[PDB]
Amino acid sequence: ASHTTLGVQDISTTAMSWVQKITGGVGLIVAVAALILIVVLCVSFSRH
Amino acid sequence: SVASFVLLSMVGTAVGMCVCARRRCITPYELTPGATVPFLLSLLCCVRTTKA
């Protein structure tokens, strides 16, 4: 029986949500902090 | 094709307005004796924001 063929892509089912929850990262906040620091420095940082 | 070149034309006049706004914003500066825009070039970044 070869009809039921499953590739590497597969349904994590409920656990899909789990990884969807895991995918959340703190890169957004770290980028925000970098932007804030670089601007408050832009008072002295013009174009470098 | 004609739509393409005409849309190129509107975007060309748009960048024309960009440069016109640049010159118009720097002109009131025109290197004033005061030489200070702490709230305009530091913020609006119109032209040559390297200086001020």
Tab-separated table of C-alpha atoms in Angstrom:
chain	number	residue	atom	x	y	z
A	1	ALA	CA	0.000	0.000	0.000
A	2	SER	CA	1.784	3.115	-1.257
A	3	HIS	CA	-1.234	5.443	-1.446
A	4	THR	CA	-0.665	6.993	1.991
A	5	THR	CA	2.609	8.795	1.308
A	6	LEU	CA	3.754	11.503	3.726
A	7	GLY	CA	6.563	13.942	3.003
A	8	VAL	CA	8.864	15.694	5.435
A	9	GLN	CA	6.137	18.304	5.828
A	10	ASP	CA	3.616	16.933	8.313
A	11	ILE	CA	0.835	18.150	10.579
A	12	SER	CA	2.030	18.815	14.115
A	13	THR	CA	-1.708	18.822	14.961
A	14	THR	CA	-2.278	20.388	18.405
A	15	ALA	CA	1.492	20.562	18.854
A	16	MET	CA	1.480	22.822	15.801
A	17	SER	CA	0.045	25.545	18.015
A	18	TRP	CA	2.794	24.749	20.511
A	19	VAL	CA	5.505	25.488	17.962
A	20	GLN	CA	3.451	28.449	16.772
A	21	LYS	CA	3.673	29.586	20.392
A	22	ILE	CA	7.375	28.704	20.529
A	23	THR	CA	8.076	30.708	17.374
A	24	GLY	CA	7.512	33.865	19.405
A	25	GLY	CA	10.863	35.517	20.009
A	26	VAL	CA	12.319	38.600	21.660
A	27	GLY	CA	14.042	39.891	18.522
A	28	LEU	CA	11.410	42.606	18.220
A	29	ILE	CA	12.164	44.055	21.659
A	30	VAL	CA	15.927	43.845	21.131
A	31	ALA	CA	15.614	45.678	17.814
A	32	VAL	CA	13.434	48.273	19.555
A	33	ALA	CA	16.111	48.786	22.209
A	34	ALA	CA	18.806	49.139	19.548
A	35	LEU	CA	16.718	51.714	17.681
A	36	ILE	CA	16.038	53.671	20.879
A	37	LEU	CA	19.702	53.769	21.868
A	38	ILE	CA	20.894	54.714	18.386
A	39	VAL	CA	18.408	57.587	18.155
A	40	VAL	CA	19.078	58.972	21.640
A	41	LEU	CA	22.673	58.858	20.426
A	42	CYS	CA	21.761	60.484	17.095
A	43	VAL	CA	21.803	63.733	19.036
A	44	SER	CA	25.558	63.196	18.596
A	45	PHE	CA	25.427	60.580	15.794
A	46	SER	CA	24.580	62.266	12.498
A	47	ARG	CA	25.375	60.024	9.510
A	48	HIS	CA	28.211	57.627	10.459
B	1	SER	CA	3.722	50.173	-23.038
B	2	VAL	CA	2.307	53.696	-23.130
B	3	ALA	CA	0.861	53.196	-19.653
B	4	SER	CA	4.356	52.141	-18.587
B	5	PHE	CA	6.099	55.227	-19.912
B	6	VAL	CA	3.433	57.563	-18.534
B	7	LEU	CA	3.638	56.001	-15.069
B	8	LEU	CA	7.394	56.431	-15.358
B	9	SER	CA	6.593	60.075	-16.123
B	10	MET	CA	4.516	60.603	-12.977
B	11	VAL	CA	7.190	58.967	-10.828
B	12	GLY	CA	9.774	61.178	-12.542
B	13	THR	CA	7.868	64.331	-11.671
B	14	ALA	CA	7.474	62.886	-8.168
B	15	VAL	CA	11.239	62.674	-7.701
B	16	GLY	CA	11.276	66.146	-9.227
B	17	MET	CA	9.056	67.311	-6.386
B	18	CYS	CA	11.404	65.528	-3.990
B	19	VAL	CA	14.373	67.563	-5.217
B	20	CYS	CA	12.246	70.724	-5.325
B	21	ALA	CA	11.231	70.223	-1.697
B	22	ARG	CA	14.887	69.625	-0.856
B	23	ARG	CA	15.981	72.939	-2.360
B	24	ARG	CA	12.968	74.771	-0.918
B	25	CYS	CA	13.684	73.465	2.584
B	26	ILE	CA	17.401	74.254	2.465
B	27	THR	CA	16.861	77.708	0.944
B	28	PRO	CA	15.437	79.347	4.107
B	29	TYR	CA	18.629	78.028	5.642
B	30	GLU	CA	20.860	79.316	2.819
B	31	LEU	CA	23.564	79.199	5.492
B	32	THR	CA	21.913	81.588	7.937
B	33	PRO	CA	24.211	83.463	10.333
B	34	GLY	CA	22.630	81.504	13.180
B	35	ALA	CA	23.298	78.126	11.524
B	36	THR	CA	21.006	76.007	13.688
B	37	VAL	CA	18.071	73.666	13.064
B	38	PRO	CA	17.850	71.538	16.248
B	39	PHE	CA	14.219	70.654	15.473
B	40	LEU	CA	14.112	70.507	11.650
B	41	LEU	CA	17.167	68.847	10.102
B	42	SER	CA	17.779	66.761	13.215
B	43	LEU	CA	14.143	65.633	12.858
B	44	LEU	CA	12.823	66.256	9.333
B	45	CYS	CA	16.114	65.125	7.740
B	46	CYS	CA	15.294	67.063	4.575
B	47	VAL	CA	18.789	67.393	3.083
B	48	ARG	CA	22.413	66.746	4.056
B	49	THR	CA	21.335	65.589	7.499
B	50	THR	CA	25.017	64.808	8.117
B	51	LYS	CA	25.284	68.426	9.291
B	52	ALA	CA	22.764	69.336	12.000
